[PDB]
Amino acid sequence: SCVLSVFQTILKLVIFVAIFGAAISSRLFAVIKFESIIHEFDPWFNYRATKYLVNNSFYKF
Amino acid sequence: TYEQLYKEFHSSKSFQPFIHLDTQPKFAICGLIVTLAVLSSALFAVGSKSSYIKKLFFYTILSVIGSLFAGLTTVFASNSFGVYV
Amino acid sequence: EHQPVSWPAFFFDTHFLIWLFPAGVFLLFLDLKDEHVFVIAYSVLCSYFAGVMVRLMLTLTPVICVSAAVALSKIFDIYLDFKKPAALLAKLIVSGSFIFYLYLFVFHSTWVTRTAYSSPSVVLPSLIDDFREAYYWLRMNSDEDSKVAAWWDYGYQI
Amino acid sequence: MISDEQLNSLAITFGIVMMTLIVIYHAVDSTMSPK
Amino acid sequence: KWKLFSMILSLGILLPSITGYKFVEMNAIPFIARDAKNRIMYFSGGSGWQFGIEIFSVSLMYIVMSALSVLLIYVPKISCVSEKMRGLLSSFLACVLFYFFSYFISCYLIKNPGYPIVF
Amino acid sequence: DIWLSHWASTIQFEEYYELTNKAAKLSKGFSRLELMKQIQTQNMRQTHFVTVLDMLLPEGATDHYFTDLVGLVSTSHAERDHFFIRPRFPIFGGWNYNFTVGWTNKLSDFLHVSSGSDEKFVASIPILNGPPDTVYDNVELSVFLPEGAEIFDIDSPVPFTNVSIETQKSYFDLNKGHVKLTFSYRNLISQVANGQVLIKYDYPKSSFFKKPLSIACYIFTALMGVFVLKTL
Ligand SMILES: *[C@@H]1O[C@H](CO)[C@@H](O[C@@H]2O[C@H](CO)[C@@H](O)[C@H](O)[C@H]2NC(C)=O)[C@H](O)[C@H]1NC(C)=O
Ligand SMILES: *[C@@H]1O[C@H](CO)[C@@H](O)[C@H](O)[C@H]1NC(C)=O
Of F220, F212, A7, nearest to B62 (Cα)? Predict the structure, then answer.
């Protein structure tokens, strides 16, 4: 088990790198073909409130 | 004087780049490999049970190298991706 | 999105976890522990609430995975433990089928995302964009304090 | 910019690599661990 | 004789739920539908309709596949039969599961005729 | 804006136009029926509304893009030494259109290293390259020299209104960012106010290689912090 733990740790990190890359890369299908924009009527308001939070303070938001 | 600066401009030599932008992705990948092939040894050293002074020494000595290599890969990769310097 | 939904839309966005899901629930029922009761209650509640209403399928998606992995992982252990060609052949035949299912799972969950869900909602690909043109007209050529009256499902965009 | 077919191939390769390394890990752990 | 009742009460509400029992309940659909030639049809073309017999067939196939998986798990815990024949039985069960999944996708093709992924 | 860069050896331009048509307004208001019925006949000879603009870029340009406040416009077309642009809506009299257009050029065409020393550079930035015959009511020309540059001389062929020097931080600028040099001109014509702003600065190698070191410092600090956080 002396040489096992290290192998399992390295493999548990390679697997998570691959998992992150397969989760992030499988969603960028509407950003490659079409410019990065905000889809869906509802998210627009969230975007406008995030712009209002990053332009004004937290107290004003 | 605009006339003398405009005279000095044309006379001088052109700009030769340090490393051409066409061969930077190669260095990007060949540095990304090394900067993690080394920084894993750092975590193995810190994890390993040994003298504190020896652990510190064999951590920093091969952490500085990984630092330099990562700080020189993150420029070639950034140029290769289209966001220069 | 406030409706019920038929059975195809369950195989659509869960390739083969949908028939390991009852297996996972049963294999949790076999040896009940403290947390298995939580997982079972979560599973049954989200299953019923997703069968009734389709907006709540997202909440059911975690328990489809966690219940399925427990059902699948056990199989692998039994068939991946090497502790005799006549037995290794059976082990390989039983594990290769499930690796093949895992690969069809990837080839399905990539095709579905490529085809259905990755569709821009502001530019019809038939590439026509007449919403952004009119909205930019209103933004450029009308004074800043003017009021626009439209039906309620465009206001956010406006 | 990366094309769409190239991105599709990249996603499929990431998924295959992940689903293979997971099985490798599980088949190592099933044997090497005390059962 | 108590955990078996909770098991039945759990599966009897888990299985008809993922098969759209509410869909046939919310919109009254006949259990059996006759064709122009008075031939009982079991599946409806498209993805936005369903017949009450489809619920039963889908739930039956889900039960068969889950039961085959559970049986694969349970095979190594019998000793009335020899090891080699046990391995042979496990392989046979895996093959049956493979062909049944293939048949299930062949049936799903009816509800979505443009499905690329096939065996 | 003009972004110099010595590591990648590319100079990239980005321009933000606010365009107004001054021709006679149209009576009875807009009507797409009339517009789409007149262009199908040969009447698009010299009409007084803007349908397509023709940007004239430097000799060899790459990575053209044409962007708008509400996103990306897809009706653009880059031929040799010419970038044709189609706005979202035709700009009739009195209509405003604000847009952005950018591209990239090789740096070897605009810099020249001096003769006496190999660390004194002379840059010749073009002052205007846009549509054929426009008129500019305000021009703000910003040149972004690299992180450690230091200006020695600045000459312009057209009298400017205001010149100033500041710093502005950009990607991977971990201290003092880039050196921004901004001129403000007031009245300029499109094709007869053709000049070249001549900057003369220096960029020593003691500050050329500080760009990787300034990131190595952060990575080393993060590692030496993780060490203490894990050993304590
Ligand atoms: C788009 O460009 C126009 C043209 O400059 C801008 O209009 C100016 O807006 C300011 C503040 O609203 C006024 O003080 C000016 O008088 C306007 N100019 C003209 C000629 O009318 C406009 O602000 C820009 N941006 C947007 C979002 O429209
Ligand atoms: C010139 O620009 C500087 C920099 O912001 C500013 O402080 C100064 O007031 C400007 N002067 C005029 C006359 O515009």
Answer: F220
Cα diameter, chain B:
71
F93 DSSP 8-state letter? T
Supply φ then ψ for residue E15, to 5 degrees: -75, -50
Residues 30-59 of A with CB under 8 A from F: 34-35, 37
Q: F14-18 long-range CB contacts below 8 Å, 24 or more apart?
A: F14/F100, F14/F101, F14/F102, F15/F100, F15/F101, F15/F102, F15/F130, F16/F98, F16/F99, F16/F100, F17/F97, F17/F98, F17/F99, F17/F100, F17/F101, F17/F130, F18/F96, F18/F97, F18/F98
Say how many Å lie between the CA of residue A51 and the centre of ligand 1: 20
Structural domain including B46 reads 1-85
Chain B nearest CA to F109, separation (Å): 8
- Out of C127, C135, C139, the one facing F74 most closely (by C-beta) is C127
Kindly state the helix (H) or strand (E) to which residue F196 belongs, with its residue range: strand F196-202
Neighbours of C152 (CB within 10 A): 6
Q: How far does the centroid of ligand 1 lie from the alpha carbon of residue F22, in Å?
A: 15
Kindly list the residues from chain D whose CB atom is less than 8 angstroms away from the CB atom of residue C109. Answer: 15
The strand pairing partners of F55, in sequence order, are F83
Element (H, E) at F16: strand F10-20
CA of residue F161 to ligand 2 center, whole Å: 9
When divided into structural domains, chain B yields a total of 1
* Calpha distance E47→E99 (Å, rounded): 24
Look-up of token digits 């038929």: C6
DSSP symbol at F26 = P
Per the structure, the count of domains in chain E is: 1
Helix, strand and coil content of chain A, in percent to the nearest 5, comes to 65, 0, 35
Inter-chain touch B70–F215, beta carbons under 8 Å: yes
Query: Which residue, F191, F13, F197, is CA-closest to F100?
Result: F13
Provide the domain limits for residue E97.
1-119
Using N-to-C axis directions, what is the helix angle for C34-52 and C21-30, rounded to 10°?
A: 150
Structure tokens at C98: 């499930």
* DSSP run (H or E) holding F13: strand F10-20
Q: Best mutation site among F20, F98, F99, F139 for ligand 1, i.e. most ligand atoms within 8 A of its Cβ? A: F98
Identify all chain D residues contacting A8, using CB atoms and an 8 Å cutoff: 25, 28-29
Please report residues of B whose CB lies closer than 8 A to that of F211: 75, 85
What is the CA angle F224-F225-F226, rounded to 5? Answer: 95
**Residues D8 and C95: beta-carbon distance below 8 Å:** no
Give the one of D11, D24, D25 whose C-beta lies nearest to A25's C-beta.
Answer: D11
At residue F162, φ and ψ (nearest 5 deg) are: -150, 140
**Cβ of A8 and D28 within 8 Å?**
yes
Q: In one letter, which amino acid is E116? A: P
Experimental resolution (Å): 3.5
